[PDB]
Each structure stands twice: as structure tokens, then as C-alpha cells.
């Protein structure tokens, strides 16, 4: 169908500015002042930030700002936030009712701070044990950057099998959220002393411990 | 803005037709003879498949079909293909600008059997409540095709107030895992009769309910 030409990265720093350009033909990004810009995250429900060459929707202040030149449009997103970590697709009207779009993109917002994790490790519930099954979640919260290496242990010597650790994904605080489950049979749970979760974030271990002799 | 609520996963074997139904909310999304539809592939640029309720674009096949009920706008793909595999989204407008987008739907060509989520809900620990923290986890495991919609309750009244959820990651056994949390104060917890976690997949919806207990 033939697509509009953009840059694939538009890196700024936390409160700088960024120009994303989107370029077409005299038939599209040049013929009509009907160019739109769209903000989309990581699998998420996908917002429109500016609608009719330059004009903004219902709340997006006057920091999401856009312009056309001739054959080129440009989105000059001012004073970088952290939230804005997103894929910014452009569009424009072709004629004869159909609409033409921009290439596969991403803005990297640089110099955001580093969070070392909140590791929350749970018991198996009094629903689960009653079901004759046992599973323990190691929740790995609000961390940046999106690299963690999870490992588990039984009394002190590793568990590799039982374990199933999820990948990194954004919290909409725009840090990261990830998990890991170790699935037991309640005989295998009630036998022991310690059952620990050991997580490696940026050259530091965060080990939490959980045990039997409780009310459950 | 916000609300247009479609299916999480819409699955189908190659041949076997699929319909994607998108329901709306009480004002705007009624006496509205618009609603367009989009497809978004791997990394690539989004494409317009249906425009204004039922019409199509130029390079679009005889395969695709959008319609009216009242609240719900369908999209019946007839003749399913590997080419057709993608995320898909339904649109609209209000204000002039104030244009609402769908919650998203995977279209999957089944290459593995269908599984419906083993949805385990945990309370916060004896210890975590010693720590003055309160967080619950809804662990959603062992599912295929790999798009789940999640939803939390506080005394049956639906939260969108403390909730972070993860993108669905493929396990050791070729099926999937996700995880949702709710964070509160140890009093925000204690203050209620019950909390719950509800998960929409294909045919399925599945709740699971925890009540605050003292362990004292």
C-alpha cells in the first residue's frame, strides 16, 4: 500500500525535547491538514494525542505539540516525563476515504532513576492446600531497569524445575512489575525448613524467605 | 479517553471463521454510525480494515466483515489465515476530538490446544502485615491462547484504583503465565468483607475470593 517514512527512535532526556518526524507524499502528508499522532505502549489500549495537524484533545497539555512543513510532519514533544516511553505512530489521509500510516517506532526517555526491587514472597493459601496443591509467588515490583534474574531454593540448595518466571513489563508508573511461581504438592511444602526466593537486580541479591510453621 | 470493551483473545484454526465483538458505554456509543477497525501485526504499522460501521479500504479482502447490533459492533473474519494473525482494535469519536478505542483483541491461529486459566489468589502474609505493607496477587497460570482480561473487586464493587498487571509470558510447557496485583494499607484491607480477582479468557470468566483474617 506504501507507508510513511519515520525515524525508529527519538531519544530525549528527562525534561529536554524531541522531534519525531513523519514523511509522506504530496498525496498524503502534504495534500491535507489531516495528519494524526498516536501514543501506544507495550501491548496496551492505544491513545490519540493530536488530531488535526496541530490541535490537541481533551487533556494533553500544550507539551504534546505538532507541526507540518510540506511533505513532512513533526511532533515536538516538550519537557520529557518518563510516562511518554512509547511507540508514536503517525497517520494521514490518502484520498478516496482511506488512511495511511507510519513505521515501527519508539522513544527512549533517558536519565530516569534506578529502582531496586520490592520482593514480596507468599505462602500457599488456605484454598489451595485444601485443594491439595501448593504454589508460591515471588512478586518483583517497581524496579528499573527491566532486568532481574530470579532463582529459588529449597532449604539452601537450588530449585530449577517447579519454577516459572515471567518477563519484564511496565507498571504504568513506567517502571517494571514481573513475577515467578514455584508449584509444589503440599507434602513437598510441609516437609521443609526454608523455601526462599533469591532475585538479582543490578549486581545485588534480594533474597526473601518463607517457611512452614504458621496458621495454615 | 476510555471505554470500549472487546474480547481479550479471539482464537481460530485456519479455515474456521472468527468474530470479534466490541461493546460500548452508555452515551456516545449508541446512536453512532461510525466505528472503524484496525489490525496491528508483529512490530509493524497499523492498518485500517473497516471504516464507518461496515465499509472497507482499497487493499482489503473480501474476507472481513463488520456490523451493528446496537451496543456491539462485530468483525467476522471468514476464511482464517496465518496472514490474518494479529492484534485488532475498534474505534469511534465524540466531542469533535474525544475518540474512543477498544481494549484490544489477539487473533490466534491455534498451534496448541486451548487452556483456561488456573487462577490462584493470595492474601498478604502474617509477616507482610507485620511490615505495614498490604498486597494481594492474582496469579493466572497455564493458558493458551495468551490474552487474558483481568479485573479486581472490593466488596463486589469494581476497582481501578490500586492495580498493576503484567503482559502474558510463555512458560516451560508452551502455555502462558500472567500476574496482577492490588496494593493497599493494612487497614484498607481489614476494612472490607471481601476482595476478588476475575479473569476473562475465551468462553471463561473465573473469580476467586479472599476475606481478611487476623491469624490472631
Amino acid at each position: 500500500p506504501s507507508a510513511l517514512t519515520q525515524p525508529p527512535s527519538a531519544s530525549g532526556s528527562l525534561g529536554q525535547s524531541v522531534t519525531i518526524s513523519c514523511t509522506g507524499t504530496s498525496s498524503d502528508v502534504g495534500g491535507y491538514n489531516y495528519v494524526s499522532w498516536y501514543q501506544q505502549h507495550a501491548g496496551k489500549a492505544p491513545k490519540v494525542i493530536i488530531y488535526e495537524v496541530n490541535k490537541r484533545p481533551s487533556g494533553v497539555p500544550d507539551r504534546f505539540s505538532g507541526s507540518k512543513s510540506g511533505n513532512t510532519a513533526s511532533l515536538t514533544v516538550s519537557g520529557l516525563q518518563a510516562e511518554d516511553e512509547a511507540d508514536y505512530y503517525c497517520s494521514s489521509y490518502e484520498g478516496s476515504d482511506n488512511f495511511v500510516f507510519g513505521t515501527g517506532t519508539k522513544v527512549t526517555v533517558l536519565g530516569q532513576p534506578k529502582a531496586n526491587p520490592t520482593v514480596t514472597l507468599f505462602p500457599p493459601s488456605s484454598e489451595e492446600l485444601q485443594a491439595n496443591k501448593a504454589t508460591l509467588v515471588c512478586l518483583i515490583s517497581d524496579f528499573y531497569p527491566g532486568a532481574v534474574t530470579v532463582a529459588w531454593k529449597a532449604d539452601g540448595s537450588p530449585v530449577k524445575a517447579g519454577v516459572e518466571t515471567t518477563k519484564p513489563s511496565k507498571q504504568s508508573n513506567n517502571k517494571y512489575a514481573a513475577s515467578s511461581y514455584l508449584s509444589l504438592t503440599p507434602e513437598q511444602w510441609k516437609s521443609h525448613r526454608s523455601y526462599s526466593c533469591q532475585v538479582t537486580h543490578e549486581g545485588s541479591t534480594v533474597e526473601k524467605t518463607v517457611a512452614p510453621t504458621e496458621c495454615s | 479517553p476510555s471505554a470500549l470493551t472487546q474480547p481479550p483473545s479471539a482464537s481460530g484454526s485456519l479455515g474456521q471463521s472468527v468474530t470479534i465483538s466490541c461493546t460500548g458505554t452508555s452515551s456516545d456509543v449508541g446512536g453512532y454510525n461510525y466505528v472503524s477497525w484496525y489490525q496491528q501485526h508483529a512490530g509493524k504499522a497499523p492498518k485500517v480494515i473497516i471504516y464507518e460501521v461496515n465499509k472497507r479500504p482499497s487493499g482489503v479482502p473480501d474476507r472481513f466483515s463488520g456490523s451493528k447490533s446496537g451496543n456491539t459492533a462485530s468483525l467476522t473474519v471468514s476464511g482464517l489465515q496465518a496472514e490474518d494473525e494479529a492484534d485488532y482494535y475498534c474505534s469511534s469519536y465524540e466531542g469533535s476530538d474525544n475518540f474512543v478505542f477498544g481494549t484490544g483483541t489477539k487473533v490466534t491461529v491455534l498451534g496448541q490446544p486451548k487452556a483456561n486459566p488456573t487462577v490462584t489468589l493470595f492474601p498478604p502474609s502474617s509477616e507482610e502485615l507485620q511490615a505495614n505493607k498490604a498486597t494481594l496477587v492474582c496469579l493466572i497460570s497455564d493458558f493458551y491462547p495468551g490474552a487474558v482480561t483481568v479485573a479486581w473487586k472490593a466488596d463486589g464493587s469494581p476497582v481501578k484504583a490500586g492495580v498493576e498487571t503484567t503482559k502474558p509470558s510463555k512458560q516451560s510447557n508452551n502455555k502462558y503465565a500472567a500476574s496482577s496485583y492490588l496494593s493497599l494499607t493494612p487497614e484498607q484491607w481489614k476494612s472490607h468483607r471481601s476482595y476478588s480477582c476475575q479473569v476473562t479468557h475465551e468462553g471463561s470468566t473465573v473469580e476467586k475470593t479472599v476475606a481478611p483474617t487476623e491469624c490472631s
Binding site: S36, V48, Y51, F99 | F99, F101
Partner: peptide, 6 residues
């Protein structure tokens, strides 16, 4: 989402 009938 768009522009317009146009």
C-alpha cells in the same frame, strides 16, 4: 482514530 465521512 481518524478524521471526519473525510
Amino acid at each position: 482514530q481518524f478524521h471526519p465521512x473525510x
